[PDB]
């Protein structure tokens, strides 16, 4: 009969840096075997220091975003300051658990800066458990992107390799290459690559084209 869920695809990616945080996602909305649109990003700007990505059932991603944006205003009208990035992640864990027995089908990754100007990445399950990481990938192609960043960022499974921290310049071309490999083998990964970069001065955006199957 009436099934309340559907899978709309989508793939998000966040990398925590030393003084930055990069959040990227594709721009394809599609369910079944069809294509709805070729322009629907997942980069949502919460504050000037926090960007959230939302992948999964798109009807829940629209609702959950508008619930969050209300509660950031209710904090400021009651506390005279904006929320920090860690305060948002502790809040949204309670929101996702509040519908424990009819859950959101949304995968969430929060990237942004902390109080000291360092990167922070919080990855969520659809129930509301979380931890702080250096890089996470969520969505449909998450099984393809996570092994590649263990090699390059994590420097895992390598011998006699020096450990330099990731610069901003190296992290840009690392993100741009890993979606090109993901767009070949995944049918859901889309056409334009919206990349949002959070620094100590604001949020920059950048759009990179992909193949359009």
């Amino acid at each position: 009969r009436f099934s309340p869920y559907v899978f709309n695809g989508g793939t998000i990616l966040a990398i925590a840096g030393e003084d930055f945080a990069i959040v990227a996602s594709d721009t394809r909305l599609s369910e079944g075997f069809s294509i709805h649109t070729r322009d629907s990003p997942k980069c949502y700007k919460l504050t000037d220091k926090t960007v959230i990505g939302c992948s999964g059932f798109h009807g829940d991603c629209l609702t959950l975003t508008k619930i969050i944006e209300a509660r950031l205003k209710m904090y400021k009208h009651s506390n005279n300051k904006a929320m920090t990035t860690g305060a948002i992640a502790a809040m949204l864990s309670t929101i996702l658990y509040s519908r424990r027995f009819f859950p959101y089908y949304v995968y969430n990754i929060i990237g942004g800066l902390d109080e000291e100007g360092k990167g922070a990445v919080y990855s969520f399950d659809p129930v509301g458990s979380y931890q702080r990481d250096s890089f996470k990938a969520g969505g449909s192609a998450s099984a393809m992107l996570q092994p590649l960043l263990d090699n390059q960022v994590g420097f895992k499974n390598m011998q006699n390799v020096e450990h330099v921290p990731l610069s901003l310049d190296r992290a840009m071309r690392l993100v741009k290459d890993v979606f090109i490999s993901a767009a070949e083998r995944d049918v859901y990964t889309g056409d334009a690559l919206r990349i949002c970069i959070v620094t100590k001065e604001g949020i920059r955006e950048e759009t990179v084209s992909l193949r359009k199957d």
Partner: protein, 228 residues
């Protein structure tokens, strides 16, 4: 003859809100001083009988690890407002994983302070001081039975309020230290109370930026008395 509990004056204020302001002139006096080094905060006990146990009563009680309190007027209905303030700081810690600031504790209590009526029964006859150290430094607030709160620098609340507020405006300056703000308050309490000052009639509690809410006891307290 009998009005309601919810009736305006012809002068326009209310009746029982204004009556509850009269009720806090019967409680024990209390003095708090905000200093950039930290908040000191003192009270008397008003011991009635020699057979009475002295430490069973208290006026300073803590809300969190970084927020203390001080009550006057009636005492039995002050314990309701203290318990609502404790639960409110834990719900803020539960959902936001941080400490609620000193100001936003006070308006959470002040919204409760004027909610009596004839649906869902009288205002609270207490007066409170809130000493705490949030991220804006040390703070000091003072609410009302009317639900009005404002940040003070050195507030004196109790039966000897206006006698102490005159003597407190002449000793305070913006560059005090915490070691002398403690000594300055006990001189004021020595003038206004009935009995002679000792280590049992009063108690103090201070909050610093470094350590948490600390309350003095009968060993480290009387060095300030003998060196008054």
């Amino acid at each position: 003859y009998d009005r309601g509990v919810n009736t305006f004056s012809p002068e326009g204020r209310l009746f029982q809100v204004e009556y509850a302001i009269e009720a806090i002139k019967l409680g024990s006096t209390a003095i708090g001083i905000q200093t950039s080094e930290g908040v000191c905060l003192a009270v008397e006990k008003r011991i009635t009988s020699p057979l009475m146990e002295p430490s069973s009563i208290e006026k300073i009680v803590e809300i969190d690890a970084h927020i203390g309190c001080a009550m006057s007027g009636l005492i039995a209905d002050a314990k309701t407002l203290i318990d609502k303030a404790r639960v409110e700081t834990q719900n803020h810690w539960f959902t936001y994983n941080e400490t609620m600031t000193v100001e936003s504790v006070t308006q959470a209590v002040s919204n409760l302070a004027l909610q009596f009526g004839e649906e869902d029964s009288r205002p609270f006859g207490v007066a409170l001081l809130f000493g705490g150290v949030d991220e804006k430094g040390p703070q000091l607030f003072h609410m009302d039975p009317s639900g009005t709160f404002v940040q003070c620098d050195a507030r004196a609340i109790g039966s000897a309020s206006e006698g102490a507020q005159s003597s407190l405006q002449e000793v305070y300056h913006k560059s005090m230290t915490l070691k002398e703000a403690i000594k300055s308050s006990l001189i004021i309490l020595k003038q206004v109370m009935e009995e002679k000052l000792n280590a049992t009639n009063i108690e103090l509690a201070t909050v610093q930026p470094g350590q948490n809410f600390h309350m003095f006891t009968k060993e480290e307290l009387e060095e300030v008395i003998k060196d008054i």
